[PDB]
Amino acid sequence: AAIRKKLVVVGDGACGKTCLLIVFSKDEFPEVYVPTVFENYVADIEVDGKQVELALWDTAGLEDYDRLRPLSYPDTDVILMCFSVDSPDSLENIPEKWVPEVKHFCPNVPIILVANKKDLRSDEHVRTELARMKQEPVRTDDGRAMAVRIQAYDYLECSAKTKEGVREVFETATRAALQKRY
C-alpha cells in the first residue's frame, strides 16, 4: 500500500531532464538525444520511513510543445525545475518562462530548482565558449540565489552523466511532495 506522488520536470530543451529521470529510475544513461514530447515513468523510493510510488512526468523543453505541456500539470505533488550549468541562458529562462508557467498551473506545489550537468562546470571547452560571450558556467551561489528569488523549496545540483547528486534530488523532491500543504 505505497503512497502515490506525482513529480513533473520542466526546463529548457536539452538541459538534461530526461537523462536525470532515466538515470534515477533505470540506472541507464540514454546515449542518443531524442527531444521529449510526453512521457510518464514509474519509480519507487523510501524516504523517512515512507514507501513512495513515484510517477515521473517528463515534459518537452522545446517551445514547439508549449500547448501540450500544461496537460502534464494537474494534481502535481512536486516540480523539478531544471537548468544546466553550461547554459546561463537556461537559468535566465527560469524566471522568464518556467516560473510563470508553473505558478499559473501549479499554485502551491513545491519546486526544487535543479542544476543539471554539473560535470561540465570545470569543462575547458564550455568555459572557453562562454567566455567569448562574457559568461561563465553557472556558479552554485548564483543557482542558490535564483532559488531564493523564485521561492523554491530547495536548490540542488547533479550530474546524470556521473550520477553525482542524482539520488539526493529525488529524496528531497519526495520529501517536498510528502509535506505539500493545501
Ligand SMILES: Nc1nc2c(ncn2[C@@H]2O[C@H](COP(=O)(O)OP(=O)(O)OP(=O)(O)O)[C@@H](O)[C@H]2O)c(=O)[nH]1
Ligand atoms: N555532460 C552532460 N551531458 C548531459 C547530462 N545529462 C544530459 N546530458 C546530455 O544533454 C543532451 C540532452 O539531455 P536530455 O536529458 O535529453 O535533455 P532534455 O532536457 O530531456 O531535452 P528535451 O526533452 O528536448 O526538453 C543530451 O546530449 C545528453 O546526453 C549530464 O549530466 N552531463
Ligand SMILES: [Mg+2]
Ligand atoms: Mg527530454
Ligand SMILES: [Mg+2]
Ligand atoms: Mg553521490
